[PDB]
Structure formats: C-alpha cells, structure tokens
C-alpha cells in the first residue's frame, strides 16, 4: 500500500521533471525540513520527498532516469523539480546553507540529460542563466 503511495508520489512528480537530486538530511529536524520544503515550494517550482531507496530504484526503471543507480545510498531526501530554471533552483540551496549555517547537509548527486555530474560539476551550471 505504501509502495503504491510512493509510486503515485513519484508518478505525479515525474510528469514535468527535468533534473533530480538527493540531499543528505543528517541532523536536520522536522521544522527545518519543513522550512526547506517551503522555501523550495513557494520560491521555486520544486517538490521534496523522502522515500525508500529501493522503491525509487524500482519506480525509475524503464525510464530515462536509469543512470542514477550509484547515487542512492544512505540518507536521501529526493528533490524533484518540475521546472527548467536551474540557477534559481540551485541558488536557493546556497541561500539556505549560508543563512542557516548547515555544512553537514550537501547535494550528493544529480541527473541531467543521461549524466551524473559531480557535486563540483553542477556548480558552474547554476551560473549560466537562460
């Protein structure tokens, strides 16, 4: 039943998605998780979901997001973005990190156009606008 819950929760979120990331939520509380979800839900066009890694593993099979497979271990909060503006999508985490002083929770892994950029590699792509 929860398998169908998160299958629907990813089937709705993959309808307009163009890149996918996963954040290590070690040490984040419920209120700060809600604040991250709020910042990235009003100020952008993104959505946050914490899900079973094997269930996202099985629910992304047969899709162009099949390259992700190494980057699904440990504590994963999956962020699905239904929009295209990656500078405003990725600078919000910079503002969040520099404001609330959270170095223990970083961006590990992302998928854009059949490629897994390094966390160093999807740093310059937020500089280029549109």
């Amino acid at each position: 039943r929860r398998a169908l819950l998160v299958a629907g929760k990813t089937k709705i979120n993959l309808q307009n998605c163009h890149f996918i990331t996963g954040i290590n939520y070690n040490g984040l509380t419920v209120k700060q998780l809600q604040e991250l979800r709020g910042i990235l839900r009003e100020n952008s066009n993104t959505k946050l979901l914490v899900a079973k890694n094997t269930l996202v593993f099985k629910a992304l099979e047969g899709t162009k997001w099949e390259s992700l497979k190494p980057c699904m271990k440990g504590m994963n909060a999956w962020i699905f973005v239904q929009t295209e503006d990656i500078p405003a999508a990725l600078k919000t985490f910079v503002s969040f990190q520099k404001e609330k002083k959270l170095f223990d929770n970083n961006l590990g892994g992302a998928v854009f156009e059949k490629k897994l950029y390094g966390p160093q590699d999807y740093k310059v792509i937020e500089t280029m606008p549109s």
């Binding site: 209120k31 809600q34 604040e35 979800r37 709020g38 839900r41 009003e42």
Partner: protein, 147 residues
Amino acid sequence: TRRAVAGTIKLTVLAGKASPGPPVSPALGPYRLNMMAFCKDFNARTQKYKPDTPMAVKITAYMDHSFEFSVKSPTVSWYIKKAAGVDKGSTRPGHLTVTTLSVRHVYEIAKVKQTDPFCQYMPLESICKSIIGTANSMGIKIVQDLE
C-alpha cells in the same frame, strides 16, 4: 545550536502586562530561569498590539540561561470562543451544544493563524480543517450558513 537543550516550557501572558511575579514566578523559577531580560524582550515587542490579550509564548530553557523564543498568536480556543459567545465549554462535547459558527469566522481565523512563525507554508484548507477539528472538541456546532 550546540547547547544541550534542557526543556521547552510554554505559557500565556496578557499583552503589555509582563510584570514578573503572578505568572512569571514559580513557573520560570522551577527551571532556574531569569525574569528580567525575558520580560524586557517580551515588552519590547507587544507595543503595537491590543492589551489584555492572552499571547502565547513558548520559551526554550537552557543550562546557560539563554532565551531563544518565538511569539505565537493567542489560542484557537480563545479565538473560536470569543468570536462566538460564552467562553464555557460543554459538559459533553460532540453531543451537547453551546454556540454555532458557519463558515466565515473559522476561515479568517485560519488567515490569522497563518501568521504563526512556522506556519508560512501550511495551506488554508489544512488550517481550516484543523480548526474544524478543534471546534468539534468543545461542543460548538458548525453549519453551512447561520440565519
């Protein structure tokens, strides 16, 4: 932060009357907390509000006597009883009825409750149905339109 959180204790104080003895006596003295600086910080912000209003203050006590508090709006029981009528709850709620409110008071109370410092992102349907659930819990009736 890095400090070992001891307790989180809440209280209700009327607006403007932060005299640290009738409600700020043993309630804050049970946890070794100070009574001067917290009252100064409390009276340094409720200058723009109507007095004799039961403002909700949650204070996170610490072992180094540091105050890190946020100010909450007055209680939804107060908001749903004072905007309705008599402040007396039923002997048997859900079956015995006191007052009646249709659709509008709960909706604007939800709009005011959205101003809670960690309710920036909860939807108005969520807040309205939460207040409906509170309204079920003291025995007041809700209808589509009182006439």
